[PDB]
């Protein structure tokens, strides 16, 4: 099941009871458009700290629409919705509650766990390789690689 852009804002509004399915009062479409724009901006800004998570950006001069698919899997809906809801509370002049904050923190931790990668430190490049590896004077295997040497040529004074 594809996750539309417009489902996220409805999920957030339902979650904080601003506007739901069974509500005698509903918000105007302008607020929904603003919410979609905010979601687009936040997903653009998430390219740095949380990293790419497969969001589908609008291509070209076309504007985002609530009926367009986002490409996000189902497992990210809660985290994205909580983040957006926290980012768009001051629009309606309200304030979060401790339970919502704890839920948002837990969802964010779950989201960050999946994409976590721990890099490893490679050897320097001047590190001797032991005699047990059976290196050969034929090759440069006498030492670990990764040095990028001998960029000499023209353009003097170097």
């Amino acid at each position: 099941t594809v996750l539309t852009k417009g489902e996220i804002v409805l999920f957030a509004l339902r979650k904080f009871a601003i506007a739901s399915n069974a509500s005698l009062t509903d918000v105007e479409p302008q607020s929904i458009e603003d919410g979609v724009n905010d979601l687009e901006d936040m997903m653009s800004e998430w390219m740095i700290n949380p990293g790419d998570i497969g969001y589908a950006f609008a291509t070209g001069d076309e504007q985002p629409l609530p009926d367009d698919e986002s490409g996000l899997p189902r497992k990210y809906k809660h985290a994205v919705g909580y983040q957006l809801l926290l980012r768009m509370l001051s629009d309606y002049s309200l304030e979060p509650t401790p339970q919502v904050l704890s839920n948002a923190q837990r969802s964010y931790d779950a989201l960050m766990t999946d994409t976590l990668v721990v890099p490893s430190m490679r050897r320097r490049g001047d590190f001797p390789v032991g005699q047990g590896n059976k290196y050969d004077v034929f090759t440069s295997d006498r030492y670990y690689p990764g040095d990028l040497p001998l960029i000499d040529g023209d353009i003097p004074n170097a």
Partner: protein, 52 residues
């Protein structure tokens, strides 16, 4: 100013060179030979097949 060597094969010498043009862990090798051919008289050779 380029590291090189000479390799022999059936009396044919091949010159090999190694250089590092480019700055992306990119190395290069090349092996070369220049041949010279002469024909003295065409009337002393050709093709032959079977006949019925």
């Amino acid at each position: 100013s380029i590291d090189s060597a000479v390799a022999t094969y059936e009396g044919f010498s091949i010159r090999v060179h190694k250089y590092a043009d480019g700055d992306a862990n990119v190395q290069k090798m090349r092996f070369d030979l220049l041949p010279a051919y002469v024909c003295f008289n065409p009337h002393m050779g050709g093709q032959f097949f079977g006949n019925p």
